[PDB]
C-alpha cells in the first residue's frame, strides 16, 4: 500500500513508476511517471489523462477519467533498463471517484462485492490454465490484392526438410506430438523456467511447466489459483 | 497394350511431358489400375451369358472361382511391383476383396450389368499397368480354366458392403496379396494351374520369381524417407 510503496522506491532506487491498467478487449496498457511524481496526493486522488484516446471508452464530450493506483499491486519490472516500479490502477470517474462502468477491473471488483452482498460466499477462487505458442517468425497481412499468414519455428514439424545454415539438427515434435518428449525435441526448457522464475519474482506462484501438445512450440506454465480479481491481475 | 504404352510414352515425350504406368506414384491420391474385362467364346457364342447371377452362365462362375482361388499367385503377375501394393491398400474403393458383385466396389471382380447377352463378362479389377500383359493375361486365363475344369464354385456374391463395414465376423473374406514377397510366395507354391498344358515351365516361373525377388530386395533393404520422420528421434 501507500506506506509500503514509498519504501520500495528507496529500497530499489526506483527511477520510474509504470502505471498499468486493462482496456475493454483485455490488453494491458501503461503510462510512465518519474518516481519523484509519487506523493501523498497521488495515492488518495490519483493522476488523470486525455483519455478520449482509448477504445470503447471514447465519449466525444466527457473524455476525462482518473487513474487510481492500487498500492497493493506494486512490483518491480524485470525487463526495463532503468529501475521502475509497476502499479496497477483502477479507472474512476472524476469527482465521484466511483469506478468507471466500462473499466474491466472495476467490474470484476463489483462482482466480488456482489458475491459477499448476497451472502452466498465471501471469496471466489479462480485457477486458469492459459496455454500459448512460442514461434521464431510470424508474418501476415491483408490488402486489396490478397492476404497471408506464415508461421515459423525451429520446432515446426514442417522444418524437418529445411536447410539451416549450420545444418538441420532434426529433433522436433511431430504434429500433436510435442507432448513431453525430453530435450532436444523439447527446445524450451530453459525458456519456460526463466518464465517461471520471473513470474514468481512478480508475485505469482508456479505449480508446473511443460511443453504442450502442438508442434511449433505450444507451451504452458501452470500457476496457483487466487481470488478472482487478483487472479485476473496475475 | 505394348503399342498403347509406346504411343502414350512417346506422344507424351513429343509434347514435353513424361508418362508413367507406375501403379502408385503419389500417396494420398488415386493410383493407376488396369481392370481386365474378360469372357470366353465358342463359334461366335458368348459362353459367359446364362441364367445364373446377373446373366452369367455357370461357366463364368467357375472361371471366377478359379481366379479367386489363385488370386495371390496371379498377383505376382498382375501386380509385379512393390509399388503395386501401395495401391492395393485397404481403401474403400481399393479392389482388394476376393469376391464378385455387380454393384459393390470393394469387390475385386465387378460384373458389368449389361443389356445384350452378347456382351456379358467379368471385370477383374486388381491388376495394374506394371504387369507384363502377356504373363498377366495368361495367368488370369489359366486360373479361370482351372476353375472350370474343376467346377470351383465362387461361393455367393458380396453385394453387401466392404470391410469398412469393419469386423462383423472380423470379415474374413479372402484378399489379394498384401505384398510382393507374398505374391511371389503364392506363385511359388500355387504354380500347378499355370504348368497345365505345359504353358508355364518351372524354370520360366522360377526365373521370373528371382528377377522380382531382387527388385523386392532393393526396396526392403533401402531406408525409406518416412522412417526418418517416424524413427530418427528414437
Ligand atoms: N479451490 C481450489 N482448490 C484447489 N486448487 C484450485 C481451486 N480452485 C482452483 N484451483 C487451480 O487448478 C489449477 C491447475 O491445473 P493443472 O491441471 O496443473 O494445469 P495443466 O494440466 O493444464 O497444465 C491450478 O491453477 C490450481 O491451483
Ligand atoms: Mn494444458
Ligand atoms: Mn473399369
Ligand atoms: Tl484408378
UniProtKB/Swiss-Prot annotation, chain B:
Positions with a binding annotation for Mn(2+) 1: 35, 123
Residues reported to bind ATP: 37-39, 105, 110, 118
Subcellular location(s) per record: Cytoplasm
Domain GS catalytic: 1-234
Positions with a binding annotation for L-glutamate: 30-31, 87, 93, 105, 125
Homology family: Belongs to the glutamine synthetase family.
Subunit structure: Oligomer of 12 subunits arranged in the form of two hexameric ring.
Name this polypeptide is given: Glutamine synthetase
Organism: Salmonella typhimurium (strain LT2 / SGSC1412 / ATCC 700720)
Residues shown, of full length: 236 to 469 of 469
